[PDB]
Scaffold this motif. Structure first.
Motif, PDB file in Angstrom:
ATOM      1  N   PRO A 127       2.712 -44.887 -72.795  1.00  0.00           N
ATOM      2  CA  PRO A 127       3.790 -43.793 -72.098  1.00  0.00           C
ATOM      3  C   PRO A 127       3.869 -44.371 -70.426  1.00  0.00           C
ATOM      4  O   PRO A 127       3.893 -43.970 -69.120  1.00  0.00           O
ATOM      5  N   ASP A 128       3.268 -45.138 -69.635  1.00  0.00           N
ATOM      6  CA  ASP A 128       3.634 -46.220 -68.742  1.00  0.00           C
ATOM      7  C   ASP A 128       5.003 -46.486 -68.392  1.00  0.00           C
ATOM      8  O   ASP A 128       4.977 -47.637 -69.340  1.00  0.00           O
ATOM      9  N   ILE A 129       5.788 -46.453 -67.497  1.00  0.00           N
ATOM     10  CA  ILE A 129       7.454 -46.243 -67.714  1.00  0.00           C
ATOM     11  C   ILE A 129       7.448 -46.345 -65.735  1.00  0.00           C
ATOM     12  O   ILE A 129       7.028 -45.404 -64.841  1.00  0.00           O
ATOM     13  N   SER A 130       9.085 -47.285 -65.893  1.00  0.00           N
ATOM     14  CA  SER A 130       9.020 -46.891 -64.356  1.00  0.00           C
ATOM     15  C   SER A 130      10.767 -47.448 -63.984  1.00  0.00           C
ATOM     16  O   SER A 130      11.598 -48.656 -65.451  1.00  0.00           O
ATOM     17  N   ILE A 131      11.750 -46.226 -63.624  1.00  0.00           N
ATOM     18  CA  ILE A 131      12.665 -46.791 -63.690  1.00  0.00           C
ATOM     19  C   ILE A 131      13.451 -46.899 -62.790  1.00  0.00           C
ATOM     20  O   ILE A 131      13.413 -45.653 -61.725  1.00  0.00           O
ATOM     21  N   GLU A 132      14.924 -47.464 -62.082  1.00  0.00           N
ATOM     22  CA  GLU A 132      15.283 -47.427 -61.053  1.00  0.00           C
ATOM     23  C   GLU A 132      16.830 -47.246 -61.565  1.00  0.00           C
ATOM     24  O   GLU A 132      17.351 -47.936 -62.082  1.00  0.00           O
ATOM     25  N   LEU A 133      17.647 -46.436 -61.150  1.00  0.00           N
ATOM     26  CA  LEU A 133      19.429 -46.875 -60.666  1.00  0.00           C
ATOM     27  C   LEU A 133      19.563 -47.495 -59.410  1.00  0.00           C
ATOM     28  O   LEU A 133      19.429 -47.318 -58.041  1.00  0.00           O
ATOM     29  N   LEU A 134      20.487 -47.973 -59.847  1.00  0.00           N
ATOM     30  CA  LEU A 134      20.907 -49.427 -58.973  1.00  0.00           C
ATOM     31  C   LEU A 134      22.094 -49.484 -58.508  1.00  0.00           C
ATOM     32  O   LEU A 134      23.030 -49.649 -59.046  1.00  0.00           O
ATOM     33  N   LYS A 135      22.568 -49.495 -57.373  1.00  0.00           N
ATOM     34  CA  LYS A 135      23.878 -49.485 -56.785  1.00  0.00           C
ATOM     35  C   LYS A 135      24.159 -51.359 -55.668  1.00  0.00           C
ATOM     36  O   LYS A 135      23.831 -51.512 -54.756  1.00  0.00           O
TER      37      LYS A 135
ATOM     38  N   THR B 101      23.436 -50.068 -62.098  1.00  0.00           N
ATOM     39  CA  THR B 101      22.404 -50.384 -63.037  1.00  0.00           C
ATOM     40  C   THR B 101      21.456 -49.809 -63.383  1.00  0.00           C
ATOM     41  O   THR B 101      21.171 -49.158 -61.913  1.00  0.00           O
ATOM     42  N   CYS B 102      21.393 -49.677 -64.300  1.00  0.00           N
ATOM     43  CA  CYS B 102      20.224 -48.960 -64.881  1.00  0.00           C
ATOM     44  C   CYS B 102      18.206 -49.971 -64.774  1.00  0.00           C
ATOM     45  O   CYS B 102      18.966 -50.663 -65.607  1.00  0.00           O
ATOM     46  N   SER B 103      17.736 -50.291 -63.967  1.00  0.00           N
ATOM     47  CA  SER B 103      16.199 -50.918 -64.459  1.00  0.00           C
ATOM     48  C   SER B 103      15.214 -50.043 -64.891  1.00  0.00           C
ATOM     49  O   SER B 103      14.572 -49.974 -64.056  1.00  0.00           O
ATOM     50  N   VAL B 104      14.878 -50.454 -66.224  1.00  0.00           N
ATOM     51  CA  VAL B 104      13.385 -49.909 -66.524  1.00  0.00           C
ATOM     52  C   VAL B 104      12.256 -51.033 -67.469  1.00  0.00           C
ATOM     53  O   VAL B 104      12.382 -52.105 -67.659  1.00  0.00           O
ATOM     54  N   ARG B 105      11.224 -50.667 -66.503  1.00  0.00           N
ATOM     55  CA  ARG B 105       9.468 -51.581 -66.077  1.00  0.00           C
ATOM     56  C   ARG B 105       8.884 -50.980 -67.773  1.00  0.00           C
ATOM     57  O   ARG B 105       8.462 -50.021 -67.326  1.00  0.00           O
ATOM     58  N   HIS B 106       8.960 -51.956 -68.692  1.00  0.00           N
ATOM     59  CA  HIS B 106       7.145 -51.706 -69.560  1.00  0.00           C
ATOM     60  C   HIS B 106       7.059 -52.209 -69.784  1.00  0.00           C
ATOM     61  O   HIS B 106       7.790 -53.855 -69.911  1.00  0.00           O
TER      62      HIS B 106
ATOM     63  N   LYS C 160       5.497 -54.438 -68.233  1.00  0.00           N
ATOM     64  CA  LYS C 160       4.995 -55.309 -67.537  1.00  0.00           C
ATOM     65  C   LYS C 160       6.183 -56.317 -67.536  1.00  0.00           C
ATOM     66  O   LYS C 160       6.842 -57.542 -67.278  1.00  0.00           O
ATOM     67  N   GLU C 161       7.590 -56.162 -67.983  1.00  0.00           N
ATOM     68  CA  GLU C 161       9.116 -56.385 -68.491  1.00  0.00           C
ATOM     69  C   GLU C 161       9.206 -55.804 -67.551  1.00  0.00           C
ATOM     70  O   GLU C 161       9.741 -54.597 -67.891  1.00  0.00           O
ATOM     71  N   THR C 162      11.339 -56.143 -66.634  1.00  0.00           N
ATOM     72  CA  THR C 162      11.948 -55.070 -66.440  1.00  0.00           C
ATOM     73  C   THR C 162      12.924 -55.624 -67.188  1.00  0.00           C
ATOM     74  O   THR C 162      13.271 -56.887 -66.931  1.00  0.00           O
ATOM     75  N   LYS C 163      13.677 -54.843 -67.517  1.00  0.00           N
ATOM     76  CA  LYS C 163      15.393 -54.632 -68.033  1.00  0.00           C
ATOM     77  C   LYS C 163      16.367 -54.267 -67.345  1.00  0.00           C
ATOM     78  O   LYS C 163      15.866 -52.752 -66.653  1.00  0.00           O
ATOM     79  N   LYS C 164      18.164 -54.283 -67.128  1.00  0.00           N
ATOM     80  CA  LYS C 164      18.397 -53.798 -66.509  1.00  0.00           C
ATOM     81  C   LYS C 164      19.305 -53.690 -67.227  1.00  0.00           C
ATOM     82  O   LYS C 164      19.847 -54.593 -68.494  1.00  0.00           O
TER      83      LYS C 164
END
Length: 97
Positions: free
Chosen positions: A33-41, A79-84, A86-90
């Motif tokens: 359950p450790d995750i991080s999310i960002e929204l990008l313009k 774009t939405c950026s997701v890190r789980h 140790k990997e970041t996917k867009k």
């Protein structure tokens, strides 16, 4: 032991250029359950985003939602950026306007 996140990027309403809308990134079914999310313009992290508190359902399912008010215009990229793990996917918002 490990599950990769299922991610969806979408608008609340059908996108129309110049019309105020909500941009949403929904992330689900990941372990751990450790995750991080960002929204990008246009490649910058968007400000004034809102994030739900992490939700846990049926003894297995974790989910999280990040949202922001936005107004789409021609040539802009969201774009939405997701890190789980140790990997970041867009993930791009791809309407057909």
């Amino acid at each position: 032991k490990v599950s990769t996140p299922k991610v969806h990027v979408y608008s609340h309403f059908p996108g129309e250029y110049g019309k105020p809308n909500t941009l949403i990134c929904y992330v689900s079914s990941f372990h751990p359950p450790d995750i991080s999310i960002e929204l990008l313009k246009n490649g910058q992290v968007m400000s004034d985003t809102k994030q739900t508190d992490l939700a846990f359902e049926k003894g297995w399912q974790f989910h999280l939602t990040k949202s922001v008010a936005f107004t789409p215009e021609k040539g802009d990229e969201y774009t939405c950026s997701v890190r789980h793990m140790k990997e970041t996917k867009k993930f791009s918002w791809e309407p057909n306007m």
